[PDB]
Amino acid sequence: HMFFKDYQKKNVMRLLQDSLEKIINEWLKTDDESHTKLKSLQELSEMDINATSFAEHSPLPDFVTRLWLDPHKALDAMDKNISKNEIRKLIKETAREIELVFTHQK
Amino acid sequence: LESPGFMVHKKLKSMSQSYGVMMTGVPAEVLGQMQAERSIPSINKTGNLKQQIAKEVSKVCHMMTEPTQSAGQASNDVCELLLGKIEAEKFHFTKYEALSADGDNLKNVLENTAPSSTNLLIRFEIDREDPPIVLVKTKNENFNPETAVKNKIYLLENKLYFIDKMGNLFNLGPGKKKCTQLFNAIGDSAEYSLCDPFVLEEPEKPEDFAISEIVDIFNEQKERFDFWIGSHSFTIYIPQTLGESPRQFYPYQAYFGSHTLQDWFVSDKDEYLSRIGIDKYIEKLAVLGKTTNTKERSDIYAEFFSKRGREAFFCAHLNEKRQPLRVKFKITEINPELALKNLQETQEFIDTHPGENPSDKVENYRNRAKLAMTEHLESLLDI
């Protein structure tokens, strides 16, 4: 067997990444003089995988923080063959690539 | 009696026609929860939340039928279904090879295979030119090629530089005197646009002529640069021939905003293009890559890649294909038994949804997705 579970996993992760892209894009389009939202995106894309105290207090979208802390309490339909450390690495990759898609470096 | 190779294509087309989005393997509750997360910023917590939620959820009887699927994800799913995880990842990591003048490399690799024994999968990537749209005028004392923003032209007092998307620094040619002339003929705004048609084709000030000159210099040597961006994605499956029959190809594709793979299959456009033969399909792709006629390029692109019936409109007027395109391909072989086992596991996943019809299984999926979206929105809105 083995085939379908990982196919489903990769498609679920891709859908998650696209949703994160849309949410953080429209969240970033409307910031202020300080670039607060861009700053927290910068901070999030380089943050160590095991940190958890920034979501105490952050301008990031609530979905992003909730998905960072415990992803499976946020989306309880997500299979547990996707690990927490897979999800925060996906969050960091998305946040980095978007922080650079919109500082226009790329 | 059909071949396992043709059996793969038959089962793929007929399963995508009937079940569509369930062929991604994404559970309905996952889909509904993610839809809720992306729809909730469009919900007014002041208002009557139950009806706003009822409408947001109303919209994914359509988000399962709306063209929200990338071409790249369609090609990725096809490649994995037909190859398995390991071989699909290896094929993905494989580098594309550009198409020949008349597609000679691809047709040669095709002719040197037996239509009886081998089943072939070709992945095509259509790249479009994404040239710099911003000229930056900077003192040489304030220019670092390492930290500078990529995909930009930089005008210095002595240099005319291009930094591509890969961070590579290119000298565009002009000497120091010409660079100082262009430098001082341009006003001292930080950046300038290279996309103003009235500056390019109807220039009047010295600024306009400087910018048009710089764009001409970039155009006469864009050959040296890599600034192509991914535009279109698709695949072509060529199954084995059952003894003494002709060989046929089948294009699979999606196009974000136009159609899904399910729509592409239900409309039979795969066979519609299959009828024109692989050799002339490749020849027209090579023409798409080597023509400078905007009308020819647009007609080829439209009839190859549009939603069926929208061919006359896909690249007409505003949607003209006026930039050149590059067609790249990669090829692998299929083990039809493994592809059929993959499709069988997918069909088992589908069969976990109750219903005597593909209709009723799709409606079970749709209802479960709607229910999950509604309850996730109620969870996120205290309702």
Side-chain angles (χ1 to χ4, degrees), chain A residues 3-106, chain B residues 2-64 66-140 142-243 245-382:
Chain A
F3 159 80
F4 179 84
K5 270 302 169 81
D6 272 87
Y7 170 80
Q8 170 177 89
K9 169 180 190 159
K10 66 122 201 171
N11 274 345
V12 168
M13 286 197 304
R14 184 69 258 221
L15 185 63
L16 181 57
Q17 198 168 42
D18 287 352
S19 321
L20 274 166
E21 280 177 27
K22 183 181 152 332
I23 295 315
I24 297 175
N25 275 132
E26 285 161 22
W27 162 81
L28 244 196
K29 288 195 270 122
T30 65
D31 202 15
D32 51 22
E33 322 174 79
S34 324
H35 295 277
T36 324
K37 291 175 168 187
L38 202 292
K39 291 197 268 227
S40 46
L41 212 62
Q42 301 197 141
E43 277 160 27
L44 161 79
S45 158
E46 311 294 330
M47 180 214 307
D48 184 273
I49 300 276
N50 313 279
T52 324
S53 179
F54 188 13
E56 176 138 49
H57 209 210
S58 167
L60 286 154
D62 224 295
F63 169 69
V64 174
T65 73
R66 285 191 294 107
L67 195 69
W68 181 276
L69 309 181
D70 190 21
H72 298 87
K73 63 133 265 177
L75 319 174
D76 52 43
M78 198 198 315
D79 200 342
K80 304 278 257 175
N81 57 16
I82 299 162
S83 82
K84 183 174 63 281
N85 283 22
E86 271 169 328
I87 286 313
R88 310 190 192 198
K89 305 164 92 190
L90 190 124
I91 290 174
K92 292 175 59 157
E93 201 176 31
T94 304
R96 176 185 328 142
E97 196 271 353
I98 294 304
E99 181 216 304
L100 309 150
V101 72
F102 265 7
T103 195
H104 275 116
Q105 263 263 351
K106 72 212 320 292
Chain B
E2 313 259 27
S3 50
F6 192 85
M7 265 298 153
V8 165
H9 160 73
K10 186 176 165 180
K11 215 212 218 292
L12 181 74
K13 177 171 184 173
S14 156
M15 276 174 72
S16 185
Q17 278 174 339
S18 287
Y19 308 112
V21 57
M22 315 167 53
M23 295 269 300
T24 75
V26 173
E29 290 77 15
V30 170
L31 184 62
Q33 288 188 335
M34 270 173 220
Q35 241 338 103
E37 289 295 350
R38 62 151 66 86
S39 285
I40 189 178
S42 96
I43 276 190
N44 208 300
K45 205 152 149 154
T46 69
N48 47 318
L49 303 198
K50 281 207 164 309
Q51 196 214 79
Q52 306 198 61
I53 289 170
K55 265 203 201 154
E56 277 309 325
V57 180
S58 81
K59 302 219 244 162
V60 314
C61 317
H62 322 326
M63 197 104 183
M64 300 156 49
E66 273 177 6
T68 41
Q69 176 188 44
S70 95
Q73 305 307 337
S75 296
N76 282 7
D77 297 345
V78 161
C79 282
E80 190 147 12
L81 285 165
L82 301 209
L83 296 164
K85 191 193 195 67
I86 306 312
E87 267 311 301
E89 307 174 328
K90 271 140 198 202
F91 192 49
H92 197 275
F93 203 69
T94 283
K95 293 263 311 153
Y96 291 83
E97 202 205 329
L99 203 62
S100 182
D102 308 348
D104 319 272
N105 42 356
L106 184 43
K107 316 168 91 178
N108 277 359
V109 184
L110 288 183
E111 247 285 9
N112 293 337
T113 72
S116 324
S117 58
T118 174
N119 304 271
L120 306 168
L121 172 61
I122 324 179
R123 175 146 190 184
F124 284 94
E125 180 104 321
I126 314 291
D127 288 337
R128 63 178 189 80
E129 265 159 16
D130 180 45
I133 65 150
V134 160
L135 185 270
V136 181
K137 191 179 136 171
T138 172
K139 262 65 179 193
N140 201 167
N142 323 137
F143 175 62
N144 201 261
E146 291 254 80
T147 85
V149 178
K150 318 188 195 317
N151 201 9
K152 284 192 185 191
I153 303 187
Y154 292 85
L155 185 51
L156 282 55
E157 291 111 332
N158 59 105
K159 276 291 145 46
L160 184 53
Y161 278 137
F162 170 47
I163 296 181
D164 67 1
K165 289 208 281 201
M166 287 290 83
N168 291 322
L169 181 66
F170 290 94
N171 194 326
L172 291 188
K176 181 202 328 159
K177 185 182 71 203
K178 187 60 186 171
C179 278
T180 299
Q181 285 173 185
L182 298 163
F183 191 93
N184 284 308
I186 284 181
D188 322 82
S189 321
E191 320 187 321
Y192 282 89
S193 161
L194 314 172
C195 296
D196 198 329
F198 301 110
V199 165
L200 293 190
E201 320 280 346
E202 291 173 23
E204 319 201 329
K205 312 270 156 223
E207 220 193 45
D208 303 354
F209 279 83
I211 294 179
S212 159
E213 259 213 77
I214 292 183
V215 168
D216 288 327
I217 294 167
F218 178 89
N219 286 330
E220 58 188 61
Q221 52 176 310
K222 45 171 60 172
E223 295 295 347
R224 301 162 62 210
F225 314 140
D226 175 26
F227 49 94
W228 310 86
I229 193 176
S231 171
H232 193 40
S233 205
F234 62 100
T235 47
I236 289 181
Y237 181 52
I238 306 177
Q240 72 197 89
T241 289
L242 53 145
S245 320
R247 197 180 212 184
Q248 314 283 267
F249 84 99
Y250 296 102
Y252 313 148
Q253 91 165 21
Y255 205 108
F256 188 92
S258 186
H259 59 275
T260 71
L261 185 46
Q262 172 183 34
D263 311 328
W264 176 270
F265 269 148
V266 165
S267 148
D268 283 301
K269 184 151 178 182
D270 57 314
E271 201 94 16
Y272 163 75
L273 279 161
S274 192
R275 276 142 79 97
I276 81 172
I278 176 60
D279 284 336
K280 201 148 223 144
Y281 190 90
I282 292 173
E283 286 152 37
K284 291 304 186 176
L285 282 176
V287 170
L288 176 70
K290 75 166 320 162
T291 196
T292 37
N293 194 357
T294 285
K295 189 75 205 329
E296 193 177 31
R297 183 183 299 124
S298 307
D299 293 328
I300 295 175
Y301 197 94
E303 261 276 30
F304 270 12
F305 307 136
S306 77
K307 176 208 252 270
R308 222 202 165 158
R310 314 273 330 160
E311 277 85 5
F313 319 114
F314 204 61
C315 304
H317 310 300
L318 193 168
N319 327 286
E320 267 181 357
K321 286 281 172 283
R322 312 151 170 174
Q323 312 221 255
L325 303 163
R326 184 190 40 170
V327 183
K328 321 171 307 190
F329 74 91
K330 50 167 78 177
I331 187 144
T332 191
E333 297 198 18
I334 300 299
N335 181 4
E337 298 195 302
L338 182 70
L340 288 178
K341 292 203 220 204
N342 295 349
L343 295 167
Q344 189 50 54
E345 268 199 279
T346 315
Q347 183 64 77
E348 286 173 14
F349 163 77
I350 284 165
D351 283 350
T352 63
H353 297 93
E356 59 160 46
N357 294 314
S359 268
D360 296 337
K361 299 189 172 308
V362 169
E363 184 76 25
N364 171 275
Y365 185 91
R366 158 169 48 254
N367 289 343
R368 285 174 53 195
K370 299 194 96 200
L371 181 47
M373 191 181 173
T374 306
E375 268 168 353
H376 198 71
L377 287 160
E378 292 169 354
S379 175
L380 294 171
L381 298 187
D382 319 64

